[PDB]
CSV table of C-alpha atoms in Angstrom, one decimal:
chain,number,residue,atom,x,y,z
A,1,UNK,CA,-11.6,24.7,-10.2
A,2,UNK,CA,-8.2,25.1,-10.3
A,3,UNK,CA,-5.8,27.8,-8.7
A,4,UNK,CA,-1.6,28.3,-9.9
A,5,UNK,CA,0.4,30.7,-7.9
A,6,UNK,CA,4.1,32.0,-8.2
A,7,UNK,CA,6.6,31.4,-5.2
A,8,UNK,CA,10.3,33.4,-4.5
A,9,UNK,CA,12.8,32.3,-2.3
A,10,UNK,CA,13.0,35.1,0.3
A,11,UNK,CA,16.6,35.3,0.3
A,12,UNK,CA,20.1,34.7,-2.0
A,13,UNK,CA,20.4,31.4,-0.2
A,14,UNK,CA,17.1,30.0,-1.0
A,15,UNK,CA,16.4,29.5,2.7
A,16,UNK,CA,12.3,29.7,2.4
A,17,UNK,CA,10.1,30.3,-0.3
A,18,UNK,CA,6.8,32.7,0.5
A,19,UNK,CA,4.1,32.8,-1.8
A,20,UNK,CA,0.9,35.4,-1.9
A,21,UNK,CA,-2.2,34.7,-0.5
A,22,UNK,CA,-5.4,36.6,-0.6
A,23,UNK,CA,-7.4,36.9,2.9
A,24,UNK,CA,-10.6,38.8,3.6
A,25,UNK,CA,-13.1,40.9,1.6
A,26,UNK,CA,-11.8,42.9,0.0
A,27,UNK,CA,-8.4,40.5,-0.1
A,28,UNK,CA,-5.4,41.6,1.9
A,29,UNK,CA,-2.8,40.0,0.1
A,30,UNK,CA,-0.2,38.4,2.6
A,31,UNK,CA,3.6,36.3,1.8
A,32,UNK,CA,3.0,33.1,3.8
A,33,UNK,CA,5.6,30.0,3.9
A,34,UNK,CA,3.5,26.9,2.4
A,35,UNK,CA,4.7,24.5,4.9
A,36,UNK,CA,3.9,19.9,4.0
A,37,UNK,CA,5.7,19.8,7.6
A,38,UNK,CA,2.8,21.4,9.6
A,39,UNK,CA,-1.4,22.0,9.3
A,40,UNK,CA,-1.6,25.6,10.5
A,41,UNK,CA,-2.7,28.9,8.7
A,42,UNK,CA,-1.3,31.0,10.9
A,43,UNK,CA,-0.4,35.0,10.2
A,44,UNK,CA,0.5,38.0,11.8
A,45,UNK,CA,-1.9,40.5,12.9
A,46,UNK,CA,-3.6,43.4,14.4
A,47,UNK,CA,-4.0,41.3,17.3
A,48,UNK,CA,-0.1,40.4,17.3
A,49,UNK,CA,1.7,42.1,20.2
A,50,UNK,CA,2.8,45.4,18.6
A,51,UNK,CA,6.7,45.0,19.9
A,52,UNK,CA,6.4,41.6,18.0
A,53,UNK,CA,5.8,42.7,15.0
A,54,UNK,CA,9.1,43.8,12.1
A,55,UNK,CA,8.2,45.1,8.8
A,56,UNK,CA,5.5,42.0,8.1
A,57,UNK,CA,2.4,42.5,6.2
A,58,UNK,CA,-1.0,42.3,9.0
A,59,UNK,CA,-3.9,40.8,8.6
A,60,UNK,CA,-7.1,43.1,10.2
A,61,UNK,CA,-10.0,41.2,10.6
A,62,UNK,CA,-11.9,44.2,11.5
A,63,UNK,CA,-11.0,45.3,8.1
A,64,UNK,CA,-12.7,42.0,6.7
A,65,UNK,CA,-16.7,42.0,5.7
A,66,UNK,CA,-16.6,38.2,5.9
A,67,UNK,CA,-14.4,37.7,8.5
A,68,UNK,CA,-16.0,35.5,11.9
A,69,UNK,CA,-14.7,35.1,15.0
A,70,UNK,CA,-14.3,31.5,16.0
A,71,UNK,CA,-15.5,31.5,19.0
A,72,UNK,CA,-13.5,29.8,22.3
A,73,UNK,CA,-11.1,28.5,19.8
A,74,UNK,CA,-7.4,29.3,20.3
A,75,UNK,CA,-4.2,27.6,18.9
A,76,UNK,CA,-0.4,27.0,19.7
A,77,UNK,CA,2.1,25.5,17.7
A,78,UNK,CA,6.4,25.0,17.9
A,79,UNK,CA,8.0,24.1,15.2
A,80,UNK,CA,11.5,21.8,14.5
A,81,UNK,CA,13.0,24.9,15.0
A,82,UNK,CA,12.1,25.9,18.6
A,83,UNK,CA,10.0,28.7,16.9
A,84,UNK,CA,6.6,28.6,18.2
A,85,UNK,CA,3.0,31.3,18.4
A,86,UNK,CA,-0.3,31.1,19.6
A,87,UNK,CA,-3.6,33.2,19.5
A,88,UNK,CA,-6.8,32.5,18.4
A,89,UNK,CA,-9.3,31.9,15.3
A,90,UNK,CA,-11.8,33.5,12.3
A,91,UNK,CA,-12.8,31.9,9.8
A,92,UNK,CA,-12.7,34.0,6.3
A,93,UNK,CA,-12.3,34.0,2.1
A,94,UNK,CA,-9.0,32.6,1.6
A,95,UNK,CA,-7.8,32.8,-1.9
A,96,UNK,CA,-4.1,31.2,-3.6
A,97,UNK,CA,-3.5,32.1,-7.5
A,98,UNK,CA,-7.4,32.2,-8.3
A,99,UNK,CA,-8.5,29.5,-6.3
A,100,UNK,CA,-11.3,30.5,-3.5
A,101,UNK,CA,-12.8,28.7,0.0
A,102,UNK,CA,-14.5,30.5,1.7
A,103,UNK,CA,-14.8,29.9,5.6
A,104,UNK,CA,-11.2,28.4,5.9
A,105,UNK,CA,-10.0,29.0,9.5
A,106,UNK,CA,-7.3,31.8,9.7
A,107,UNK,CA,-5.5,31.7,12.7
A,108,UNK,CA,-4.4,34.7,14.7
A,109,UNK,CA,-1.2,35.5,16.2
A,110,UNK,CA,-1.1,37.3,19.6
A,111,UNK,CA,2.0,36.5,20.0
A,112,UNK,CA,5.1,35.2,17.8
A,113,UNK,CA,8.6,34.2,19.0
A,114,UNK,CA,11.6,35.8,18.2
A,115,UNK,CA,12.8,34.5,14.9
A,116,UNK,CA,9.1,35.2,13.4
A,117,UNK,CA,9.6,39.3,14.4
A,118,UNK,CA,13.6,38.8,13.1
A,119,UNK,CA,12.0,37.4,9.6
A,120,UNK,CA,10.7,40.6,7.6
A,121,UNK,CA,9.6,38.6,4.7
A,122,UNK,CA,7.2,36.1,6.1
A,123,UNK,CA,3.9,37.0,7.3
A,124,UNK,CA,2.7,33.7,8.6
A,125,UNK,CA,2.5,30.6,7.5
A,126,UNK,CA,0.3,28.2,5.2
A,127,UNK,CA,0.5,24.4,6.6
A,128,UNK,CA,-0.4,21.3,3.5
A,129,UNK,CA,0.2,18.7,6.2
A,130,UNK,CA,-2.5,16.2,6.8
A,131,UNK,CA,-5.3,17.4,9.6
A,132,UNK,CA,-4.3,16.0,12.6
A,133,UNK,CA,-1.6,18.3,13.2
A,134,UNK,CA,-3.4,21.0,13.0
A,135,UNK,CA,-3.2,22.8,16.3
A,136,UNK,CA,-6.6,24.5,16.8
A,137,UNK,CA,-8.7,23.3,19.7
A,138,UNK,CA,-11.3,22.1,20.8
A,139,UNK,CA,-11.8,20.9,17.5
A,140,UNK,CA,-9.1,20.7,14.8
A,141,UNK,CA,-9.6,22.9,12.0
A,142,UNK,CA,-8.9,21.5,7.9
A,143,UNK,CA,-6.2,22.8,6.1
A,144,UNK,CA,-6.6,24.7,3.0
A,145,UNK,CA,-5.9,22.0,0.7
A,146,UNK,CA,-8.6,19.8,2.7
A,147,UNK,CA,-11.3,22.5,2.1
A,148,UNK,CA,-10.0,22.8,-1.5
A,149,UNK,CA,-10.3,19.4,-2.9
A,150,UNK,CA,-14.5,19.3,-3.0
A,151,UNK,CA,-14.1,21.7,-5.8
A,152,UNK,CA,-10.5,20.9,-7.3
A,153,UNK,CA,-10.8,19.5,-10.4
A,154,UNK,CA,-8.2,16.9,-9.1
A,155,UNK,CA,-7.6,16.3,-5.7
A,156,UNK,CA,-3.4,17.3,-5.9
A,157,UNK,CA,-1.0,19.8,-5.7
A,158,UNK,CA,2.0,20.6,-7.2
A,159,UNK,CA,5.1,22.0,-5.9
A,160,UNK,CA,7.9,23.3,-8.4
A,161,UNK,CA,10.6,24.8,-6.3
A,162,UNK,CA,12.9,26.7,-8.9
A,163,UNK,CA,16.4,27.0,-7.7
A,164,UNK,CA,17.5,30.8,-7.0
A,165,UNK,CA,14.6,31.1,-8.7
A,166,UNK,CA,10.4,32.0,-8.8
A,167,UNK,CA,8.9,28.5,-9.2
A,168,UNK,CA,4.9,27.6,-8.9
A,169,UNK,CA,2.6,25.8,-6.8
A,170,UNK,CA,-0.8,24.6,-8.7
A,171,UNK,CA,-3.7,23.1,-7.0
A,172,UNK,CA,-6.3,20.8,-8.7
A,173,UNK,CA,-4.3,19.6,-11.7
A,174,UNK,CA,-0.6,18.5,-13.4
A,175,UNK,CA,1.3,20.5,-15.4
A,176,UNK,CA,3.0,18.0,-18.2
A,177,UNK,CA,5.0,20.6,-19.5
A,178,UNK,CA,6.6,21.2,-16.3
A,179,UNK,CA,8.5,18.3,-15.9
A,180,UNK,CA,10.1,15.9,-18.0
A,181,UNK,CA,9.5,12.1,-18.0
A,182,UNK,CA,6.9,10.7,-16.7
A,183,UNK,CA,5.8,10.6,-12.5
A,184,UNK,CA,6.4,8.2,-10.4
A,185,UNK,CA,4.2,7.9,-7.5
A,186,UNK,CA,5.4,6.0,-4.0
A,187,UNK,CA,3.0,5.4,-1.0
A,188,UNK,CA,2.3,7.8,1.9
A,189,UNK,CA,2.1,7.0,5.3
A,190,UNK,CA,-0.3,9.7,7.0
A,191,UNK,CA,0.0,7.5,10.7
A,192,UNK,CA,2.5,10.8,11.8
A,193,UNK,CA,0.5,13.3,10.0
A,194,UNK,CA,3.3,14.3,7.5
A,195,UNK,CA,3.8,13.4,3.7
A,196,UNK,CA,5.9,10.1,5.1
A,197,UNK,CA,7.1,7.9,2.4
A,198,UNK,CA,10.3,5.7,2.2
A,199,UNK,CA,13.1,6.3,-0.4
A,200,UNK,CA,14.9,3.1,-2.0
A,201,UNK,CA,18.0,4.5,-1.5
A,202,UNK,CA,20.9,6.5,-2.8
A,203,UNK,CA,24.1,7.2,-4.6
A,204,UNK,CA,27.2,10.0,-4.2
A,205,UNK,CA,28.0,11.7,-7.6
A,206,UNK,CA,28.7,8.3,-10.7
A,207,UNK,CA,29.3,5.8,-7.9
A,208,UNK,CA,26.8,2.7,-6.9
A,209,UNK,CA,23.7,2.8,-6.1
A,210,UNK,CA,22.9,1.3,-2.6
A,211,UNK,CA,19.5,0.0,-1.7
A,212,UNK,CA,18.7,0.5,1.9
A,213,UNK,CA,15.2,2.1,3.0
A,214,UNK,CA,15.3,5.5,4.0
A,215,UNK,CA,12.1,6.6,5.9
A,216,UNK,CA,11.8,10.7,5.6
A,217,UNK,CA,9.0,13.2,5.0
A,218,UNK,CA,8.5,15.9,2.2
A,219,UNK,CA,8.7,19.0,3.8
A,220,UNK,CA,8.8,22.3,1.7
A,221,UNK,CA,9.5,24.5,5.0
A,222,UNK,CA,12.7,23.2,5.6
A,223,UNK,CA,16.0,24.2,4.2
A,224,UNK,CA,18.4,21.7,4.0
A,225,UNK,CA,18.3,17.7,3.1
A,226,UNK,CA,18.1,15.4,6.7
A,227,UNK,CA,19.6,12.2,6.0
A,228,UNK,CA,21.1,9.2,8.6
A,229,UNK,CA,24.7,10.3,9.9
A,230,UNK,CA,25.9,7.4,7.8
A,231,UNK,CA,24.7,8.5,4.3
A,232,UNK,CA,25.7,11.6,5.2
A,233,UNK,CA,29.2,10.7,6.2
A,234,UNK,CA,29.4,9.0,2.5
A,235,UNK,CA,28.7,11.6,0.5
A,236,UNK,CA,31.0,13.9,2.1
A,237,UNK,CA,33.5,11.6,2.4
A,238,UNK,CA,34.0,12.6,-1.7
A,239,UNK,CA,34.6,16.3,-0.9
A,240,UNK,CA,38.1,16.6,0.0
A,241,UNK,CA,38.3,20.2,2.0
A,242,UNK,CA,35.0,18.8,3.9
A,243,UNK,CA,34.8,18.1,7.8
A,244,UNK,CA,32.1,18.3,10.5
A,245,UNK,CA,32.3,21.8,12.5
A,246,UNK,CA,30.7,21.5,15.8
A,247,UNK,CA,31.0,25.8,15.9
A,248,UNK,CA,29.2,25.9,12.9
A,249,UNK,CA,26.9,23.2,13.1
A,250,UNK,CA,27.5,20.7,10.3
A,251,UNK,CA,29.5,19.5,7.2
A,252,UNK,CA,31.5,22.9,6.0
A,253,UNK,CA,33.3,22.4,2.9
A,254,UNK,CA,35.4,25.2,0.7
A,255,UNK,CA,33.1,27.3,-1.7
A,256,UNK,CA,35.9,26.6,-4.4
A,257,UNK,CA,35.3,22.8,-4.5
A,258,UNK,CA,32.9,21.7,-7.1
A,259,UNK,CA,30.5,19.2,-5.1
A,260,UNK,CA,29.2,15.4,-6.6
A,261,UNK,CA,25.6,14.8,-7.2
A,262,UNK,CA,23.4,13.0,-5.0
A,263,UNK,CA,21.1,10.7,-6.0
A,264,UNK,CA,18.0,9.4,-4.2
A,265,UNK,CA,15.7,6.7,-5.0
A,266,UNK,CA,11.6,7.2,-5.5
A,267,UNK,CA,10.8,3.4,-6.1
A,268,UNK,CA,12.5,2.2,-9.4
A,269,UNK,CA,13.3,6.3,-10.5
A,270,UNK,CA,16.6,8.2,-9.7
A,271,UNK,CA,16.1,12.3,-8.5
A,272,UNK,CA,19.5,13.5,-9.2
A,273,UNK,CA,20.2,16.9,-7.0
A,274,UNK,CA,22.9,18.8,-8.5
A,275,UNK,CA,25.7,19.0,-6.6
A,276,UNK,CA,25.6,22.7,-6.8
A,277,UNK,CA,21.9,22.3,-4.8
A,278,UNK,CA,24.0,21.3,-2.3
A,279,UNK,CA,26.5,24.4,-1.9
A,280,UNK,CA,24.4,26.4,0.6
A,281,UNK,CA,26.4,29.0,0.2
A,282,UNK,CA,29.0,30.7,2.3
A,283,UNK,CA,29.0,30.5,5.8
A,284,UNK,CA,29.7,34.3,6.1
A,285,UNK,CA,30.1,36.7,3.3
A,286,UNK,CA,33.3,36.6,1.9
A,287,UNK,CA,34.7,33.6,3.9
A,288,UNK,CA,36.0,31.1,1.9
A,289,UNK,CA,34.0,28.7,3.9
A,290,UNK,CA,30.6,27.3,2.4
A,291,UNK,CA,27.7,25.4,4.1
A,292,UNK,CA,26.8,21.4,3.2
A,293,UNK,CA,22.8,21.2,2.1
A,294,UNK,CA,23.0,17.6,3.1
A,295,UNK,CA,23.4,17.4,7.2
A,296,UNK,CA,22.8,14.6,9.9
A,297,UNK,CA,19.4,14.3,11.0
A,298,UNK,CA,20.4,12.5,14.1
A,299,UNK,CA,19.2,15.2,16.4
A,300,UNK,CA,15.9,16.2,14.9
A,301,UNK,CA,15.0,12.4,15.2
A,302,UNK,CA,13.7,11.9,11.6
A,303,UNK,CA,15.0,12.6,8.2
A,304,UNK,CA,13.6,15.7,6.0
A,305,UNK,CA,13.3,15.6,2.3
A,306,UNK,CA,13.5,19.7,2.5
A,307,UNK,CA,13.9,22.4,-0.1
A,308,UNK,CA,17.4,20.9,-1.2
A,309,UNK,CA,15.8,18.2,-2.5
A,310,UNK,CA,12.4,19.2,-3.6
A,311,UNK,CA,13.9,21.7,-6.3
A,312,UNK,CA,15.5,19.4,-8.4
A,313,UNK,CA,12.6,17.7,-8.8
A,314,UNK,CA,8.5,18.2,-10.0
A,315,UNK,CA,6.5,17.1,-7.1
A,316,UNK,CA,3.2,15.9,-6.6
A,317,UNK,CA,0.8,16.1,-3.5
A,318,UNK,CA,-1.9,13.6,-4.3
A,319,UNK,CA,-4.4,13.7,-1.9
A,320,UNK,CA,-6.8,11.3,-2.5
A,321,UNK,CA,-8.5,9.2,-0.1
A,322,UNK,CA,-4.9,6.7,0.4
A,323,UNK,CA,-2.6,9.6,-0.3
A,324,UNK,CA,0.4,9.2,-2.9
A,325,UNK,CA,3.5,11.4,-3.6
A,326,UNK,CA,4.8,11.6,-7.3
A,327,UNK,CA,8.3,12.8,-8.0
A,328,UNK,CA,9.5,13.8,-11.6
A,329,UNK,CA,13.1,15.1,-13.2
A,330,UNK,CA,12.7,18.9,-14.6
């Protein structure tokens, strides 16, 4: 079987992408936040603490004929982010753009923190990492994608972020008219839990290419593009209104400058972000200050292939027994 589901950016600024999911008989169709940076399905509730919950969308388990409690099981998670919840488990009929598993572990929220209640447009979250991350205990529970691939026609996903822009996420096969090209596929390293793979290296708008190994993860629920403090001092080292702002948190540049390309490398193949991918937009309406999408990742402590990067290209989740990752131009 196969499923193929439409995701929107929540906001102007592309800042998250949430994509419905089906829970429950009959379905209760939540917008969760499909996450390669974390192994939790995670929404909010009736059982979510009532001041904690905005204008999200609930899941009732009450409401759900195959909904089960699972029992003694409880969960807790934080995120890169400081965000963090907790609560505790069912298992129930999960469905994503036609494809069904039924007893996947949905987890409960009793609780959320502050930035989940501020955030109207997400109801919870749907994590693609590998296993061991997953939070639940005593005993882990699999992620959607792991219960999925016994019945996938092909053990993959797909992730085709569009920029300002619906894009798709497929499970179980490739779309070739998608992408242009062909794939090419680089090794995973699961010994963190993440989609870990190493970049050959990279090049600021027509200048050279430089080959030095840049270890980072694939995440599609973050933002911005993570890179070493000294790639990222090169690039914006060819934007003449940019500087570092310690009040605003990173590389600010002037929304009027048009920015270079970036370039990074997936073995032998160039992904070429636009450099208008890279104008986050304006750091307050009207200012005539904009945002850098390519910041320092020398305080999170590793570097982030985030949503920056992954739209401007086709990219495959191949989850096979010795996991690959496949990127492709569009």
């Amino acid at each position: 079987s196969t499923g193929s589901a439409t995701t929107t950016p929540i906001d102007s600024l592309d800042d998250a992408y949430i994509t419905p999911v089906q829970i429950g008989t009959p379905a209760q169709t939540l917008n969760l936040d499909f996450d390669t940076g974390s192994s939790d399905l995670w929404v909010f509730s009736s059982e979510t603490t009532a001041s904690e919950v905005d204008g999200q969308t609930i899941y009732t388990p009450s409401k759900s004929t195959t909904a089960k409690l699972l029992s003694g099981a409880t969960w807790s998670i934080s995120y890169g982010d400081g965000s963090s919840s907790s609560g505790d488990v069912y298992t129930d009929t999960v469905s994503v753009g036609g494809l069904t598993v039924t007893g996947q572990a949905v987890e409960s929220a009793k609780k959320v923190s502050s930035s989940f209640t501020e955030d109207s447009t997400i109801d919870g979250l749907l994590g693609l990492a590998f296993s061991t991350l997953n939070t639940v205990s005593p005993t882990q529970q699999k992620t959607f994608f792991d219960n999925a691939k016994a019945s996938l026609d092909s053990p993959v996903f797909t992730a085709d972020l569009g920029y300002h822009a619906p894009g798709t996420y497929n499970f179980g096969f490739i779309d070739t008219t998608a992408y242009t090209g062909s794939i090419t596929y680089t090794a995973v390293s699961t010994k963190q839990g993440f989609w870990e793979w190493t970049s050959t290296g990279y090049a600021v708008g027509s200048g050279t290419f430089k080959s030095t190994s840049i270890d980072g993860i694939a995440d599609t629920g973050t933002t911005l593009l993570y890179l070493p403090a000294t790639v990222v001092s090169a690039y914006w080292a060819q934007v003449s209104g940019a500087k570092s702002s310690s009040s605003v948190g990173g590389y600010v540049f002037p929304c009027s400058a048009t920015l270079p390309s970036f370039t990074f490398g997936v073995g032998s193949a160039r992904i070429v972000i636009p450099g208008d991918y890279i104008d986050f937009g304006p750091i307050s309406t009207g200012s005539s200050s904009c945002f850098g999408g390519i910041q320092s990742s020398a305080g999170i402590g590793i570097n982030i292939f985030g949503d920056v990067a992954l739209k401007a290209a086709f990219v495959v989740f191949n989850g096979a027994t010795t996991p690959t990752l496949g990127f492709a131009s569009k």
